[PDB]
Design a protein around this ligand. Sequence first.
Ligand SMILES: [Zn+2]
Ligand SMILES: [Zn+2]
Lengths: 65, 49, 49, 49, 1636
Amino acid sequence: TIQTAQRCDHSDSIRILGENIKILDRSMKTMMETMKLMMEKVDLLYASTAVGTSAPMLPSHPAPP
Amino acid sequence: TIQTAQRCDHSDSIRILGENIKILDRSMKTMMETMKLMMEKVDLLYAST
Amino acid sequence: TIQTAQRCDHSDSIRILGENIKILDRSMKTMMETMKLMMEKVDLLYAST
Amino acid sequence: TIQTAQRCDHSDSIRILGENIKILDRSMKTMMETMKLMMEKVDLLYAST
Amino acid sequence: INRTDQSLKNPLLGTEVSFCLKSSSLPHHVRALGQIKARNLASCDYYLLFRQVVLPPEVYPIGVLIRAAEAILTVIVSAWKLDHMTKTLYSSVRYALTNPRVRAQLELHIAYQRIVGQVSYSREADIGPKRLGNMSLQFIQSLVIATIDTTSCLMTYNHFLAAADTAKSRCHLLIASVVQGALWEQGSFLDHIINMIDIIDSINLPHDDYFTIIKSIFPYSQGLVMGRHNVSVSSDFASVFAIPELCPQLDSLLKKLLQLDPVLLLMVSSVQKSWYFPEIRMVDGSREQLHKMRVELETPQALLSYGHTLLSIFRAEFIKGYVSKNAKWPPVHLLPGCDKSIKNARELGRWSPAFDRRWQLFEKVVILRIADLDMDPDFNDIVSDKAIISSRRDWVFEYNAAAFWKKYGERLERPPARSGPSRLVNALIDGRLDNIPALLEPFYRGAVEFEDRLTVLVPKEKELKVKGRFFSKQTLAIRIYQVVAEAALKNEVMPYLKTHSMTMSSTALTHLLNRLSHTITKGDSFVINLDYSSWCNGFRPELQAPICRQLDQMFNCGYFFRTGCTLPCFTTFIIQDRFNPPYSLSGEPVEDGVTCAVGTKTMGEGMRQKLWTILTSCWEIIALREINVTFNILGQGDNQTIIIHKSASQNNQLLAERALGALYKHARLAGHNLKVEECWVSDCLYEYGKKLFFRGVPVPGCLKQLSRVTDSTGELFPNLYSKLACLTSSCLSAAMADTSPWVALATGVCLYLIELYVELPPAIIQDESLLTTLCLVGPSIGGLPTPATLPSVFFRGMSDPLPFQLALLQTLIKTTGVTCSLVNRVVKLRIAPYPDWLSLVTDPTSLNIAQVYRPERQIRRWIEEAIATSSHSSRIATFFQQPLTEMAQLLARDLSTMMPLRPRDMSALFALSNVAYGLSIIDLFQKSSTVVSASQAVHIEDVALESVRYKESIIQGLLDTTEGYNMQPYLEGCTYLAAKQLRRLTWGRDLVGVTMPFVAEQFHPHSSVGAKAELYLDAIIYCPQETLRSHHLTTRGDQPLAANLVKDTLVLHQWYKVRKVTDPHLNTLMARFLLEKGYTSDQGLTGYVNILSTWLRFSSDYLHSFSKSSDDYTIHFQHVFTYGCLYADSVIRSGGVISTPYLLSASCKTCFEKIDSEEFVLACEPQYRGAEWLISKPFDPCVSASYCLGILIGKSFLVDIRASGHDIMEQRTWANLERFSVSDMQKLPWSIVIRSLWRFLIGARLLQFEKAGLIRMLYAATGPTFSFLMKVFQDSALLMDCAPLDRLSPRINFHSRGDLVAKLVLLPFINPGIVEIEVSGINSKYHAVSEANMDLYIAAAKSVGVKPTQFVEETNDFTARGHHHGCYSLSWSKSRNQSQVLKMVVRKLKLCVLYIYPTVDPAVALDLCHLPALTIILVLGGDPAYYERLLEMDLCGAVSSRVDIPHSLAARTHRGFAVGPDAGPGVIRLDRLESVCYAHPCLEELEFNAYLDSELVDISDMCCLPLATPCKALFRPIYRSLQSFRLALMDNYSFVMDLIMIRGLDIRPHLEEFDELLVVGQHILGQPVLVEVVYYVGVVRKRPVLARHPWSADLKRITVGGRAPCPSAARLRDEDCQGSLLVGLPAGLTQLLIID
Ligand SMILES: [Zn+2]
Ligand SMILES: [Zn+2]
């Protein structure tokens, strides 16, 4: 009875899971920024080559929620 | 006994991790969609080659 | 006792957590086969210049 | 009472997703190596124009 | 119709004329081409014709105008009671209208205006050959054909408008200049103006060079001024321009003006829009504009890198702002590699200074979501004055089909039907704006549809740039995007940025400016003016991409902002120049590089006006900080004023040079080539807010503002009323901003009379009396707007225009030869049949008259049918066509049921109403641009006929002689009562709440030369600190100078619950109001007179009648003080000098009405159901007030201690602690406030630094501090009734009331013995009382009760038969014997009245005052300084009770017995005896002999009178009881011991005070009193040390000299008392007392 509880407790494991999820979130943010840099470069290049022609303004973001 | 059960339940942590994984999935959809446009931005460049 | 005992149920949550993990991994594999698309496209671009 | 505790027992399931976290984490890492490489590829492309 | 303009409002364009001259096929062009003579000067040279127009002298009989202006000005001034000024004004205008040149200019202006009025808005096509002197103007549709002899000048109508506008501006300028010269230290500068006009008119250079000269005239004058009065930093700005090489005469004239007076030169040269305007060179201007838009000064990669740097600095500044505001870092993410310092700063939450110099560290920090973007703009700004187009399918509309056919050879295929709903309003009505976020989604996604990718470039009108200053008119979607982005940036970002916050805030900015105005003269804090000539055509996408991406991440509006930085790359730009259309290929314009451009780098002028400011501040800050110089930035956009403070390291010259170099370098990197031809460094001249300060004093704008003719007849068809209203608004604005009220008023009267002369027929014009009455009638009682009857001109705040109107009419009737019958037949009063409560709620002060002259607009009529047509219904278009007017009328009538009818509160209630918001929205939708122009354009015959209809109607109305309501009874007696009666009659319910009287009627000025006592019974006294003269008028003196509806409803709820009322109906109405919004649960004076005010001291001594009772009267102090200062200004400017103090006495008794402190009891249950469709989105106060006052004062002191000497001249307490009365404060039991302050201070427990600062400044007194404390603490009642003080009174020793208050308020840190006793009282809920509702508690405590009484404590008196008790007042003072001798002499002479001159010692006068059964008459000569000093010194009511103020202020020489003169009849004289030859029973040594009119007064038999409760002037704190002296001595000893522990505190001043008590104790003990004693003070082993012998090298030696035995100590020198003193005293204190 008494010993059957702590075995059912996994506070450390859940904390590790949460910390790993936070690491995932951090790396996701880093990817967001790197992708934003890529988008900046490509968008600016496309816009520069666009002036003087009728090239369509291709969307650069999926959609509002 | 009851106090032991309280430590055995981590709904609050479950809530935050569920929300975190959800927002991760949303970020993933955004990743895929944003990348999907680059092909349209580069394919014409290959044609220009 | 029974009212609070039922609240301890988390099987339904575990189901959606598993499905979330599966779909997230599927998105990961999709992005892998996506990036692999332009991998060679930009790798052979070394000879392009 | 014991059966109720067994019903709440999901450590094994947790263990499963725990390993997936590494497969998540490890997977996550590779992304950088396939994005940083293209990040600098674009950077040295934008400069040369 | 045609020629639908009466003022110049479009840029001149010669394209149409050139096209016509090329054999155009248009019939009217053919007609015009057949009339030009042989020599046809090009339209570019239109000014060359209109400069040669000369009318025969004296063509218009304007003599009646001169007489009328004279009479009107005389009446106005007399009504103001400044009669002595009349002459000046009464002459100046005459002179202005008699000078041949000015008269000729005025006649030319009249002829021009008549010509304009005979042609504009004409049904006819071509008007016959109108004559304008020697011209032969011949209009043809929108083309004019000027003709001076054998010289035609075929031009466009806009050219003629420009010429007429030039003539009007010149007339305004001449009249204003003459009037100003009259009222001006060095007057009559009209000659220079005329010479300048002739010189400029003599220029003969080509068009471009002429306009270059005209444009450069003003900057060149600035350069000349700077190059002559730059003390520190050299300037060469004047050398850039080429005026000296092109117009030598103009250069010489400017040099002469500079020699005379720089301010005069700056004023005269500021008139830019008074010389004929240029004809923009479209062919060479549009191409240059387009090329400049898409030029690249920097490679895009370098631009992107510098953009990243700008992003870094922006992040740093935003983080600093956010943490300074919310005391925590915003949600941020640190990329890998972030510096540990940033990590720690975020973890704790703070802003380490090192960041500001190390912004580069922030490149690794990204700000996460901080807010959200509100995709829902309010209609108020969405439809502001900015023309737009429906969509891309509209460009064909803005061109001429015939010209397009001629240019290419094919039709325009213009859609016959209107392809777009005209301007913003029509498109809005069509229902497009129903769903905003759905409309902005393409921006969010980043692909704006092709329909919204067109922008039209429109040249800017009324400018001197030959090549144009194109601005942008953009499609609807882009306009909405710009509005939303600008709102978001202005709300959720800009306030955080430090640089812009100090300019957004009204108060903060002012402080800064004041500081600068007080520093540039001193030789430090110079100024750099930067002028980015290519600001708008600058920014490229690369520079904006980083900050734009960061912003998009902030608001989580994906790519919403970023789209703006690349949109111009996909946009199509065309030039709005009819008769020059771009070619079309497939329904879209083609690119030619001259008229059309497919895609450019920059969005255009105005677009993203805010983000650009953010970036500009960013790179300027980067430029400056890298050289480490303190600075401030004030940016108006194109131009930036950078204040650079002095640095001891280098002189100002080197600092300025380095700053300029850095700014150039760091603005080049941002692709903004900053040519050094418009940026200059100065320390004497600087511009901000379009005001040009010279040496910190604003340069008068009279010449500029009065010469700046506005649009006139705006948003309506032409009519006399609109023109008069615009003129009146211009005059009021000129007076309010920066101008002499007299100059503005006189110029306004002259211009108003001229305008009437233009329109009205000779029947009315040639009638002097009728013209005068018509000009004085005013709009209030119903009449054409006028600049005369505007009390708001002289005064700043809210004004009641009715009583002033009646006062003016009374004065007119009484002075001029005009009878009441004429006023009746001119006013034509007619009470409305029924109350129109809507008008009252909209305008509380108005009457129920029928405003016959007011123009009835019909804009609602056009839009009412517009919504009906096409049945479009999704928005305001449909759910605002409900009977809103009827619902508003119902609500107003419902509000009318208030028993004590209060129109002010009525309007307040009818402000938090959904119906009120709807009415306001309708009004803005009507009275705005982009609607009248659109509505007028679609339907214009209506206005064409309406103009003539209105003109005929008004002429007929003015001509008829039938009288209206007999206004006789309201043109006599007090104007206040008359106004009340008139309001009651016209309304029928006796309005109470708005009748504040006419100050001039209320108060009559007078000079103290011969003022009688009665005049001083109720008066406000002004004292000039020296003789006043015109010089003082400029040199400063020394003396001190949406969602809101719900919160407003809640605030009003709290306010009305505080006032102790129970109105179920009002609660029901408020609940109904809140139901819709969804909450269904629960001194200062005016600008003109400040400088003169600084040399004057105000007061309030009429308390004898109107300030003793707590009841508040109708008086308005701001207005009264402004009026008095205006009187002084008038006396000065009329050639007089103000030497003696002068008063404003109370004249009209009935104009002082006790304010009705009543509450409204609204009777009928409200019937305003609601407007569900509107608004889509959702214990006694004394204790609380006392605790709030305590904490407020505590924090005020806490902020004052921080401020340095340079930051204390500002009187702005922490939060406006000053706007309080005196009685209100006296209501609160002061004990409570004192306990609260003590508790706050002890709880605060500040360390040594703050404690030392408090000690020093409180023993001193500066700023919103002990200064205002003493201000509040004149009344001695509070002191003796202040429970803390009475217990403390026997515990401390003082020397003046300025020291007792300091000891009382510093008790917490000096005497814990009693403060820790009173600290017992406490209540947690009282602590929670927030200060945001501070005023609520004061209002709740407004009528608590009655303030305490003053009592009259006695002084040691004497009698012939008395008992010598040995007590004597002023024992410590040297004048002790003198004061006692005077008292004995007075009692011996049995005087009932005594005169005291200011020469007598203040202490002696006070002691004489405390005598009973004696009347004191100070010979103050109108200066209450001496009496104020006596009141401050005393601590009882004797002075206030026994000093006759009305007689004292009215007495210049004594009448009877007096003291202070050395000789004279009845003068009391004291002759000091060389040797004391008599031992008076009361005075041991008689040191003086008393004489009266050369006769000695015997006082030998005099003896002491039985003493009783004595005043504090006897210094009871140290009483006969040595134990009291022991208490005081021990307390001071402990306080000094505590002070010694304060590091860095100058303890010497306290040590002298302590040594005084030590001397007293030594005298008591019998020890010798050493003249000098050396004390050694220091902290040894963490303990205080005060010893006369140096036993530690660290003790600071302090020497105290001048020690003398206090005679007051003689009484305490009892033999048995010596032992009791030393019993129990501290050992150190005993050692100090005992001299070795
Ligand atoms: Zn009166
Ligand atoms: Zn007293």
